[PDB]
Amino acid sequence: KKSVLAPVLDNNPIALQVLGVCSALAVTTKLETAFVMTLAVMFVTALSNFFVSLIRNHIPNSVRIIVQMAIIASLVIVVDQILKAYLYDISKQLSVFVGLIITNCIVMGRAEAFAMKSEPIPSFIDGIGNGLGYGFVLMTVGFFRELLGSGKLFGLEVLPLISNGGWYQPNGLMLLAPSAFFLIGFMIWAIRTFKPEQVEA
Amino acid sequence: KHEKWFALYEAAATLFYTPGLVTKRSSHVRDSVDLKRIMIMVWLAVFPAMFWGMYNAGGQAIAALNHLYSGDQLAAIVAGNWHYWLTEMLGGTMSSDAGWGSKMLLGATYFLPIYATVFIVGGFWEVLFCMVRKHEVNEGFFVTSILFALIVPPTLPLWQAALGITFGVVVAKEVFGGTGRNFLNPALAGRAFLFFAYPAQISGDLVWTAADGYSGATALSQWAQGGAGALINNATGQTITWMDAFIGNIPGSIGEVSTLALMIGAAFIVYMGIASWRIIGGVMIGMILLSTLFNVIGSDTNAMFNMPWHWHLVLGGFAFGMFFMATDPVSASFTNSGKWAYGILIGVMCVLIRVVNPAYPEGMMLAILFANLFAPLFDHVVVERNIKRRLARYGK
Amino acid sequence: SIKKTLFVVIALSLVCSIIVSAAAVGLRDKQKENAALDKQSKILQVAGIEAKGSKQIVELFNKSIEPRLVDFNTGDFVEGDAANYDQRKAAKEASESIKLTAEQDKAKIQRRANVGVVYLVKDGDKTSKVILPVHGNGLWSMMYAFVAVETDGNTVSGLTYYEQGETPGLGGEVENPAWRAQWVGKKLFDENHKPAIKIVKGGAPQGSEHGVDGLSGATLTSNGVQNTFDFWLGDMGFGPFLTKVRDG
Amino acid sequence: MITIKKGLDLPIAGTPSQVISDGKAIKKVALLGEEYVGMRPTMHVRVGDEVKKAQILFEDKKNPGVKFTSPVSGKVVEINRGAKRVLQSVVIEVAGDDQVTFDKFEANQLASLNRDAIKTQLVESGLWTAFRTRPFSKVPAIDSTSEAIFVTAMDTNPLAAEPTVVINEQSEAFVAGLDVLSALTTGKVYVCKKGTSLPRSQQPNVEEHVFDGPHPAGLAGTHMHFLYPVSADHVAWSINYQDVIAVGQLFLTGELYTQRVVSLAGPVVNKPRLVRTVMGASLEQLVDSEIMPGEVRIISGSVLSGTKATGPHAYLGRYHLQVSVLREGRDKELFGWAMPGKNKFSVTRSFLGHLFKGQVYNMTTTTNGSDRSMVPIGNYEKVMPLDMEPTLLLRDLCAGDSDSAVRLGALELDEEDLALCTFVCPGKYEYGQLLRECLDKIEKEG
Amino acid sequence: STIIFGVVMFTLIILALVLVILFAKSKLVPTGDITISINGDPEKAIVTQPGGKLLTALAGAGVFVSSACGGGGSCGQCRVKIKSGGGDILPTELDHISKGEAREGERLACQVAVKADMDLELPEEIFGVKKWECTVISNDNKATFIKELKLAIPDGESVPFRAGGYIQIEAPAHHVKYADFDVPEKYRGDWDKFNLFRYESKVDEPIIRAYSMANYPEEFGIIMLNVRIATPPPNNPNVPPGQMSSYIWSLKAGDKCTISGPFGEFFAKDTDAEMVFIGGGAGMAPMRSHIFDQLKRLKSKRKMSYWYGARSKREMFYVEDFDGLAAENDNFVWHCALSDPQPEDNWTGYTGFIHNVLYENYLKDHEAPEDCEYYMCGPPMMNAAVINMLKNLGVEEENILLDDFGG
Amino acid sequence: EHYISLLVKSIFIENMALSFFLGMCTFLAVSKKVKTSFGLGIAVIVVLTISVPVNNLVYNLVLKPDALVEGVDLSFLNFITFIGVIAALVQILEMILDRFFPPLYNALGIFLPLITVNCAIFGGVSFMVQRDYSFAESVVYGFGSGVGWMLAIVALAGIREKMKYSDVPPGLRGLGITFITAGLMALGFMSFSGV
Ligand SMILES: Cc1cc2nc3c(=O)[nH]c(=O)nc-3n(C[C@H](O)[C@H](O)[C@H](O)COP(=O)(O)OP(=O)(O)OC[C@H]3O[C@@H](n4cnc5c(N)ncnc54)[C@H](O)[C@@H]3O)c2cc1C
Numbered sequence A: 001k002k003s004v005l006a007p008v009l010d011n012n013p014i015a016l017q018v019l020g021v022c023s024a025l026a027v028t029t030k031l032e033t034a035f036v037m038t039l040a041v042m043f044v045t046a047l048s049n050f051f052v053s054l055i056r057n058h059i060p061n062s063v064r065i066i067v068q069m070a071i072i073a074s075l076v077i078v079v080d081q082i083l084k085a086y087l088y089d090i091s092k093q094l095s096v097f098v099g100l101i102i103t104n105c106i107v108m109g110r111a112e113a114f115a116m117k118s119e120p121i122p123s124f125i126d127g128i129g130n131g132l133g134y135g136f137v138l139m140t141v142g143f144f145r146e147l148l149g150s151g152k153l154f155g156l157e158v159l160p161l162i163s164n165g166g167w168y169q170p171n172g173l174m175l176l177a178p179s180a181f182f183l184i185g186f187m188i189w190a191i192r193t194f195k196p197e198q199v200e201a
Numbered sequence B: 001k002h003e004k005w006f007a008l009y010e011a012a013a014t015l016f017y018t019p020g021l022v023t024k025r026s027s028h029v030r031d032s033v034d035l036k037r038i039m040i041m042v043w044l045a046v047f048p049a050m051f052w053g054m055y056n057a058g059g060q061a062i063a064a065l066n067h068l069y070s071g072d073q074l075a076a077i078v079a080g081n082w083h084y085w086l087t088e089m090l091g092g093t094m095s096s097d098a099g100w101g102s103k104m105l106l107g108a109t110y111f112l113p114i115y116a117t118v119f120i121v122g123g124f125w126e127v128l129f130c131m132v133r134k135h136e137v138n139e140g141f142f143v144t145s146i147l148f149a150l151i152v153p154p155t156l157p158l159w160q161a162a163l164g165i166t167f168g169v170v171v172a173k174e175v176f177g178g179t180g181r182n183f184l185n186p187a188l189a190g191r192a193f194l195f196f197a198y199p200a201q202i203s204g205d206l207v208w209t210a211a212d213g214y215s216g217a218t219a220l221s222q223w224a225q226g227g228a229g230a231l232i233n234n235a236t237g238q239t240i241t242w243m244d245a246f247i248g249n250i251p252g253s254i255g256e257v258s259t260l261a262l263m264i265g266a267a268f269i270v271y272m273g274i275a276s277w278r279i280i281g282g283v284m285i286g287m288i289l290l291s292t293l294f295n296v297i298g299s300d301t302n303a304m305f306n307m308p309w310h311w312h313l314v315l316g317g318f319a320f321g322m323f324f325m326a327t328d329p330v331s332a333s334f335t336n337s338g339k340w341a342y343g344i345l346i347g348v349m350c351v352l353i354r355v356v357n358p359a360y361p362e363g364m365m366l367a368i369l370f371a372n373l374f375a376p377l378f379d380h381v382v383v384e385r386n387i388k389r390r391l392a393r394y395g396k
Numbered sequence C: 001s002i003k004k005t006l007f008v009v010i011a012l013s014l015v016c017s018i019i020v021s022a023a024a025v026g027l028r029d030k031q032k033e034n035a036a037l038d039k040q041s042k043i044l045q046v047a048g049i050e051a052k053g054s055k056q057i058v059e060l061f062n063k064s065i066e067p068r069l070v071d072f073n074t075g076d077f078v079e080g081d082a083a084n085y086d087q088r089k090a091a092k093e094a095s096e097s098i099k100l101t102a103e104q105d106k107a108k109i110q111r112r113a114n115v116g117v118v119y120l121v122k123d124g125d126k127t128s129k130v131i132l133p134v135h136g137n138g139l140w141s142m143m144y145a146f147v148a149v150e151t152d153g154n155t156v157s158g159l160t161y162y163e164q165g166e167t168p169g170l171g172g173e174v175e176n177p178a179w180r181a182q183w184v185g186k187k188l189f190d191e192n193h194k195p196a197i198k199i200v201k202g203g204a205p206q207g208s209e210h211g212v213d214g215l216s217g218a219t220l221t222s223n224g225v226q227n228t229f230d231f232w233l234g235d236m237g238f239g240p241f242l243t244k245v246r247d248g
Numbered sequence D: 001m002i003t004i005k006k007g008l009d010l011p012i013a014g015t016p017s018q019v020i021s022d023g024k025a026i027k028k029v030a031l032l033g034e035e036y037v038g039m040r041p042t043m044h045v046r047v048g049d050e051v052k053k054a055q056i057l058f059e060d061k062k063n064p065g066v067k068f069t070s071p072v073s074g075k076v077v078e079i080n081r082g083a084k085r086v087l088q089s090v091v092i093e094v095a096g097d098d099q100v101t102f103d104k105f106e107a108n109q110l111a112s113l114n115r116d117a118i119k120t121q122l123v124e125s126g127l128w129t130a131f132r133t134r135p136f137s138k139v140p141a142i143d144s145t146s147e148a149i150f151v152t153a154m155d156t157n158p159l160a161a162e163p164t165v166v167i168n169e170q171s172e173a174f175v176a177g178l179d180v181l182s183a184l185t186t187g188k189v190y191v192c193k194k195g196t197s198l199p200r201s202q203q204p205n206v207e208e209h210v211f212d213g214p215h216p217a218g219l220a221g222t223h224m225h226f227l228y229p230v231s232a233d234h235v236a237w238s239i240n241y242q243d244v245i246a247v248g249q250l251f252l253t254g255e256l257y258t259q260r261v262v263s264l265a266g267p268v269v270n271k272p273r274l275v276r277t278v279m280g281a282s283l284e285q286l287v288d289s290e291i292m293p294g295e296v297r298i299i300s301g302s303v304l305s306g307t308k309a310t311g312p313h314a315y316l317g318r319y320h321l322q323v324s325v326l327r328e329g330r331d332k333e334l335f336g337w338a339m340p341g342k343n344k345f346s347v348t349r350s351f352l353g354h355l356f357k358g359q360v361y362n363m364t365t366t367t368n369g370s371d372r373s374m375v376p377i378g379n380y381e382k383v384m385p386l387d388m389e390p391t392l393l394l395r396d397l398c399a400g401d402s403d404s405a406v407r408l409g410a411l412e413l414d415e416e417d418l419a420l421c422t423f424v425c426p427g428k429y430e431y432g433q434l435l436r437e438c439l440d441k442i443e444k445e446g
Numbered sequence E: 001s002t003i004i005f006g007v008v009m010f011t012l013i014i015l016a017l018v019l020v021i022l023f024a025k026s027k028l029v030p031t032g033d034i035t036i037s038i039n040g041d042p043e044k045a046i047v048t049q050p051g052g053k054l055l056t057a058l059a060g061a062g063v064f065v066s067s068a069c070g071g072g073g074s075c076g077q078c079r080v081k082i083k084s085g086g087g088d089i090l091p092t093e094l095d096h097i098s099k100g101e102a103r104e105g106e107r108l109a110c111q112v113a114v115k116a117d118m119d120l121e122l123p124e125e126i127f128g129v130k131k132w133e134c135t136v137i138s139n140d141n142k143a144t145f146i147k148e149l150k151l152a153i154p155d156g157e158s159v160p161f162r163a164g165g166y167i168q169i170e171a172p173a174h175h176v177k178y179a180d181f182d183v184p185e186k187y188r189g190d191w192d193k194f195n196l197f198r199y200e201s202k203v204d205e206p207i208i209r210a211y212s213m214a215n216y217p218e219e220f221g222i223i224m225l226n227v228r229i230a231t232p233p234p235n236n237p238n239v240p241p242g243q244m245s246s247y248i249w250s251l252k253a254g255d256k257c258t259i260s261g262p263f264g265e266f267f268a269k270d271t272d273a274e275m276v277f278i279g280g281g282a283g284m285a286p287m288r289s290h291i292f293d294q295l296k297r298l299k300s301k302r303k304m305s306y307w308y309g310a311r312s313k314r315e316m317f318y319v320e321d322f323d324g325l326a327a328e329n330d331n332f333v334w335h336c337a338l339s340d341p342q343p344e345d346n347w348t349g350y351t352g353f354i355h356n357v358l359y360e361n362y363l364k365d366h367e368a369p370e371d372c373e374y375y376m377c378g379p380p381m382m383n384a385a386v387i388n389m390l391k392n393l394g395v396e397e398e399n400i401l402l403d404d405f406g407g
Numbered sequence F: 001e002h003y004i005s006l007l008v009k010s011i012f013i014e015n016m017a018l019s020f021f022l023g024m025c026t027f028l029a030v031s032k033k034v035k036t037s038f039g040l041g042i043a044v045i046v047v048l049t050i051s052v053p054v055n056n057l058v059y060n061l062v063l064k065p066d067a068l069v070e071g072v073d074l075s076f077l078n079f080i081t082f083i084g085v086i087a088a089l090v091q092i093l094e095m096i097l098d099r100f101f102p103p104l105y106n107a108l109g110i111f112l113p114l115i116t117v118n119c120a121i122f123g124g125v126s127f128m129v130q131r132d133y134s135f136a137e138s139v140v141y142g143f144g145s146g147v148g149w150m151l152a153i154v155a156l157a158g159i160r161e162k163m164k165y166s167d168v169p170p171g172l173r174g175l176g177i178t179f180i181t182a183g184l185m186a187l188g189f190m191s192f193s194g195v
C-alpha cells in the first residue's frame, strides 16, 4: 500500500519528476480523454514493468533501447487496437498521443529504474502506483480545465452555458495550451507548500 | 498590533512623504530619480491619452445612439443603461448637440469603473503577495493598472477586467518576484488572457463602440475587409480620413485611438529618458520595412498588403503599444543592440500579424509578447559577442 | 555472447509479433463498423431519424439510408461501392480529383473529388430527401457538414456540422442547435436557378427565404460557411445534380 | 589621446580652491584595517607601544611578507576592533621624531636598480601597500611581479585635488618614483594624466596617456580597460601620483615620506581647499573649525567612493586623497518625489535642474528613495564607458552569479568603478558591496 | 496470411536494426582493454577492460583509494589527480571539489567513468595502503557510549601513520545482539533506562567504515580506537542500530579485526603558534594522538591547551595520561567541562558546555585568539557551537581544523 | 515554393514544443543553460532530419497500405517501426560521432541519450504519417520541426537565465516557475495560430 501511494504525492512523476508532461498538456481538455489516458498509461506501464522484470536477467544490453521498446510498443499497439475498437470516439479525441505512450517518459523511467532490478510483482505494483499518480495529476488538471472551459464534467452539463440558455460564460483559455501549463505549475506550487521537503534549493 | 498591515502602512507613509533614509555605504550621494518618480512620470504620460480616450468614447457612443435611435425610443434606451441616465443626472445630454463636456462625462462613466476595478483587484493581489512574502509594496502597479485599463474596449465587463488584471499581476508578475523581476508585460499578459479566454467581449464589432445595440467595425477590420475604400464610419456616415485616425476620432480602446496624445506623452517620457528611444526607433524601422515590403509585393486578394506604413502607425494600438508597452524596460532587452533588435522584432511581428493573420485584426499585443519571449536571446547574443571581444583583450 | 542476445531478441520479436499481429488482424473487421457508425449516426441525425445504440443505428441506416455516388461534372448517378467510398482520399489523388483554380476555388479547397457520395433518405420505396456532404475552409480548419435537401431540390430540411475546428462560442456556434435549426425551411436556389442561400451579418430578416443569421462576432467563420455553400451549390459543385433532382 | 563620452560629472557645491595651504596640526594618526582588501592582521604592537616612523604595526596573514608600517612616530593609543574582532583601525598619538631609515640613491641610478632591491626596500618601508592588483584590488604578493603599473596622475573624482598642483612642487620626487617604477615593472608604466603637462621620465618604459572626459576617465580601472585589459592571468598594478611621489622621496632621501595633499571640500566646508596632512590623519581634528554648524557626514575620499569618517574609521584612508563633508539628509518632504526638481541633480532629464546648465547642487546623503528592484532605464549604459554590458553585469552581481559576472568582466572592476552605477540606480543598490562579495567568492573558490 | 507477412516484416525490421547497431559497435568502439598509468611507474600501470568506474580498477590493483560513500560521489574521500583523460568534470563533482582543484585536476574516481586511456598521479599515501588482521587485546568501556578498541598488529609491526590520521575497518556479514555486549555496571545506567539492550544488528554483506586512532606513531605495535555506539535515536528507536558500531561493541578479547590504511587529512600545522584542542566524545581518540605526538615525538614547546566537553564524570577517560603530560610539560594544559555533573561525581570544576567554558575562561581574555590554531572534533552540536563561537571571535576558517565524523 | 511554406509552418505556425507539448520533459529539464539547450537543439535537429525521411521511406515502401501485397496493410506496425528506427539511428549517430568526430560527439553526442526515443521525434514522425508528405517534403518538415523545437528550448533557456535574478516563491522554484514560464511562452507563440 505504501509503495502504491508513494508516487501519488510524495514522488509524483509530474510534480517531483518531469516525466509524462507531454501527454498532460494535450489530453486534459476533457475528463473522458484524461481518464482513459490514465487507464491506458497504468495498464501499459504495469504490464511492461512485469514483462521487463521477467526478462530482467537475459537482455542484449547492446540494443537495450530496442528491446525495452519492443515490449512497450507491442503493449501500446494492443491498447490502441482496443481503444479504436472500444471507445473509438475517445481514441479519435486522443489523436496521436495514444502512440506517444511508448515514448511517455514514465513508462521508460519505471522500466529501467525499477523493472530491470526488481521482482515482477513489486515491479507491477510500482508501475500501477506511478500510473495512479500520473493519473491523479491528469484528472486534477482535466477536471479544472473541463469545468472552467465547457462547464461540463465527463460530458455532463454541470454549469449551464449562456449559449444553452444558462448563466456561465465558458473560459476559452482553458481549452488552449497555456492553461494546462499554468494549472500544472500551480498544482506543483500547492503540493510543494503542503510537502515542503520537495522544495528545490 | 496591526503588524500584518505594516507593509501597506509604510507604502502610504512613503507615498505621502519621502523616506528619511540616508546612504550607508558605497556612493554617499544618490541620484534624485527613484522608481516612484519614474512610475508617476509614466502614469502622467498617458493622462492626455486617457482624457482624449474618454472624450472619443463618449462622442462615438453619442453619435451611434443618435444615428440608431431617436425620439421616445432614445429616451427608453437612455433609461435602460446606467451610464446614459447617470450622464443625464450629472448635467450631460445624450442628444446629438452634446458638447465636449457630456462626451467626456460619458467616457468617464465607461472608463472610471474599469480603472477602479482593475486598480482595486490588482492592488489587492499585489498587497497580498507583499504582506505574505514580507515585501515592500512597489509603485509599478500604478502604471500596470492604468495601462491595462487603457487597452480594453469601453464595454468590457468589470468581472472580465478583474480576471484579466488578476492574471496579469499574479501569473505574469508576482510569481516571478514582482516589480522588476518578471520577464513578461503584465498589462499585455492580462489583455492576452482576455483575448484568448473571452474573445467575444474583446473582439468583433459590438464592443469597440459604447452604444448598446450598435454594430460597427473599426478602421483595421474595415481595411482588411475592403481596403482603404472601406474606411467608413457608420455612426456618422463619414469616411475615416488619415487625419481622423491620427487625432483619434475613431472607435477603439480608451486611449489607443489618438496617436497625437500618445506621441506627446511618449515624447515627454523619451526626453526624460524613462522610455528607451532605441526600442521606439526599432519598432518604427521594423514596421516601415515590412509595410514597404508588403506594398511592393502587393496582393489582389488581401487588402492589408496595400496599407502604407503611415496608415499602420495611426490604426489600431500600434502607437500605444510601441510607446507605452514596447518600452517596458523590465520585459525589454538590457543591451542597446539588443534593444534595437527587440524593437525591430516587435514592429515586424505586429505588421505580420496585421497582414497575414486573418484571425487577429491587430497584433500589437501578440507582437510585444513574442518579442518579450526573445529579448533574452538578443541579450545573450550581444553578451556572447562582448565576451568574445573580452577574451581577445579587445585587440590590445 | 552475441548468440544469446540475438536469439533472445528474435524470440521476443516473434512472440510479441504474434500477439500484435493477431490483435490487429482479428479486430480489423470491428474497426470498420466502429468507424462507420459515427458517420451513420450523423446521417441519421441530419436525416431527422432518431436512433440510439450501435445496433439501432446500423439497422436504421441500412433500412432507410441509401448511399450513392454522383459525378459532379455531369451531375449523374454512377455505379460503385458508395457504402465504402472515401471522398477525402479520392480528392487527394489526381485520378479521382481535379485541381481548382483561384477563381473557381471559392471555398478554398485545394482539390475536388471527381465523384462524390450522397445519401438518399427514403421514407418508403421512394426517396424523401437527399443528404449532401459539403465542406469548406473556415477561419481555423476545414469544416465538414451534411445538408438535407428536399426532393424538390430547392428546400433545405436540415444541416449539421459534423467536423469543424473553430473557437468555441465564436466559431463553434455551427454546432449550436438553434443556428442549425434556423436553416430548416430555407431555399437554396432562387427563381433563376442560381445559388441564393445567404448568411446575413448581424441577423437575417425574419422569414427570409434564403437569409440565415450569421454567427455573432464570427464574421470570418460565417464567410467561410457562405463560401462553402456558394461553391458546393455552383456549377462545379452539386448544382447540376440538384437540377437533375429538381427534374427527377 | 583617449576620449571618454559616457560618464557623469557630479556638480557638488564646494569645489576646492586648488591652492595648497597648511592644515590643522594633527596629533593623532591611524591605519585602517578594512581599507585593505582581504587583509587578516597579525598585530605586532599593543596599546602603549612606542613606534617609530616606519615601524611595522601588523603583518598580513594572506600576503606573507607584506608589512604595514606606521605613518608617524608615537605611542599606540588604541586598537579599535569591530564585529568579529575585525581590525577597525590602529591609532597612534604623534610624538617625537624617531624614524627608520633606508638606503638612499641619486636620481641618475634609480632606473638601474635591481628589481629585488626595489621590492625589498618598498616592502620594508611599507610603501608596497600603495600598489593594488586590479583583478581583486589587493596588495601584490611580495614575490609576484606585473608587466603594467598604472600611475593615476589624474583625479576626476568630485571635489578632488588637481594632481598638477601637487606634482609641480614635487617634480623631482615624481620623476624619481617614475624611474623606480620603470625599473620595478616587468613591462611598461602607464602614466594616465590629463592634457596638462606633467614631469616626464626619460625612461622608454614610462609612457604617458591622456584621458579626457567625465569622472570615469579618471579611475584606474578605466585606464587599464583602455590600455592593458586585465584578466585572471593578466594582473596590472595601480598606484596614485602621491604614492609615486612618496616612492621617489623614499628612494632619494632614504626616509618614508608620509606628507600628503588632500582636498578638504563639500557643501558644508567654509573654505574648501588643498591642505597638507599626514597619512591617516585624524579627520575629526583635520576638519576642526572648518565646517558649518549642523549634523554633517565626513567622508574619507570621494563621495562616490569613500568611507564614513565616524568613530574608529574617522581617519584618512590609505588610498584616499580627499575629504568630503556632506549634510545629513534626514528630512522628510511631502511629495518630494513629485516636485519639479529645480535644485535636484539627476543623470536623467526628469528634473528641472538639468535645464539650468552650470548649476551647483548642495547634495546631501539622502538616498532620494527606498530600496527597490532594479528597473533599467539606461542610466547604467549612460554612466559606464567601458566595453561592457552594465545592466546584465549588475543583474549578475545582484543575483550572486559569480561565474556569469566574471564572464561579463567583473574581474576588471573595483568598488570605485561601480560607484556611478550605484549613484544612478533607481532601486538604490550598493553595487560596490555586491561586487566585493562576488570578488571575494571568486578568490575563495579560485 | 496477413498475420504471417506482418510477423516476418516485424522480425526483419527489428533484426536489421539490432544487426546495424551490433555491427556499428564492433566496427566503431575499440574493444581493446584500456590502460591507466598510476604515478607514471610502468609496474603500477593497470590494464583493465572498458567499463566500470576508476575506483573499481584501482581497488583491483595494489593501490587502494579511500572511499566512504562508494559509487555515489558523495563523501569525496576518493579524490585523485587525473593529469590527462577522463573528460570534463561532471556537475556532482564540483559540489565537493572547488574550481581551483578542478584546474589542478582533482576528480572523483567513483564518479569518473573509465572509457579511455588516463594518466594518474596518485600520492604515495594512496599508493602505500596496507592491510592487517590484528588481534583484539581489550574492548573495555571508557564511557557510557564509547569503547576503547585495542588491536595488536601481527608480528608487532606498526602502521606508518601520522598523528590525526585514521584507518578503515572492514566487517563481514554477521549478526550481533546488544545484550551480548560486555557493558560494566558502572556504565549500564542509561542502557537500563532506555532498554538499549533490545537492539540487534544484522549485516548481510561485507562493509567498511572509517575510524581514527587514539595512539601516536611511537606507540609501537598497537592501534587504539575510541568507537562510539551509534544507537538508534530516541525519537526513532525502531530504525536499525549502527552496523559497524554494534559490530565493534560485540567484539571481545582475542577476536580478529581487519583494518586497512593508514589514511587521514586532519594533521597538525608546522608552525610555532599556540594550539587549542577541543574534544567531544570519540574525538578523544584522534585528539590524544596529536598531543602526545607533539610532546613525545616532536617535543614541541608550543603553548597547548586542551578542552574536553562531557556530560558527567564517568564520561571522562584518559585522565591519568593527560594529567601526567600536564605535570611533565609546563607548556601544555587541559580541562574538562561537564554539562550535567552527577551528585556522586562531587564535581567542583568547570560545568556546562565546552565552548562556553573555553570562551569565558580562556578566549575572552586572550589578546590574539585569531593567531591560535584550533583543532576540534566532537558531536555535531558541539562542533557547530564551537565553530560559531570561534567565528564570532574573528578566527578565520583556516585556523579552524575540523575532524567531522559525519554524525 | 511549397517547401518554404512547409518550413515556416514547421518552425513558427506549428511549433513542436509549445503548440504540441512534445518534448516537454526534456524541454523543461535541460532548459537551464543556453549552451546546453542549444546543444540539445542541434541534436534534435539532426535526429529529426534523419528520422523523418527514413521513416517516410519505410512507410511509403513497406508499411504503406496495399504497397507490398494487394489486400494487406501493415499499418498496425507503425508506432514500433518508427520507434525502433529512431532508437537505432540515434545510437548509430552517437557511436559514429564518438569514433570519428570527438568534438561533435561532445557537442552533440552527449545530448543524444536524452533524445533516444524522445517524445518529440515520435510526435513529428507520426504527424508526418498522419499527413501525405513526399520525401523532400518530409526532409523539410523534419528540419523545420527540429529548428522550431530548438528555437523554443533556446528561448526558454534564455528566459531562465534572465530569471536568475527573479525571486520566485518557494514551491514555485524550479519546476513550477518553469511550467508557468512555458505557459507564458505558449501564450506569446499563439500569435501565428491563425496563419
Ligand atoms: C574520517 C572519519 C573518521 C571517523 N572516526 C571515527 C572514530 O574515531 N570513532 C567513531 O566512532 N566513528 C568514527 N567515524 C564515523 C564512522 O565511520 C561511522 O560513521 C560511525 O561509527 C557509525 O557507525 P555505524 O556504521 O554503526 O553507523 P550507521 O550504520 O551508519 O548508522 C547511522 C545512525 O543512523 C541510524 N539509522 C540507520 N538506519 C536509519 C534509518 N533508516 N532512519 C533513521 N536512522 C537510521 C543508526 O541507528 C545509527 O544511529 C569516522 C568517520 C570518518 C569519515
Ligand SMILES: Cc1cc2nc3c(=O)[nH]c(=O)nc-3n(C[C@H](O)[C@H](O)[C@H](O)CO)c2cc1C
Binding pocket: B038, B039, B042, B140, B143, B144, B145, B147, B178, B179, B180, B181, B182, B184, B185, B186, B187, B188, B269, B274, B275, B276, B324, B325, B326, B327, B328, B329, B330, B331, D375
Ligand atoms: C517606460 C515604462 C513603461 C512601462 N510599461 C509598462 C507596460 O506596458 N505594462 C506594464 O504592466 N507595466 C509597465 N511598466 C511598469 C513596469 O516597469 C513593468 O510592469 C515591468 O514589466 C515590471 O515592473 C512600465 C514602466 C516604465 C518605466
Ligand code: FES
Binding pocket: E066, E067, E068, E069, E070, E071, E072, E073, E074, E075, E076, E077, E078, E108, E109, E110, E111
Ligand atoms: S567514494 Fe565517496 S566521493 Fe567517491
Ligand code: FES
Binding pocket: A019, A020, A021, A022, A023, A103, A104, A105, A106, F021, F022, F023, F024, F025, F026, F118, F119, F120
Ligand atoms: S517528452 Fe516525456 S512524455 Fe514527451
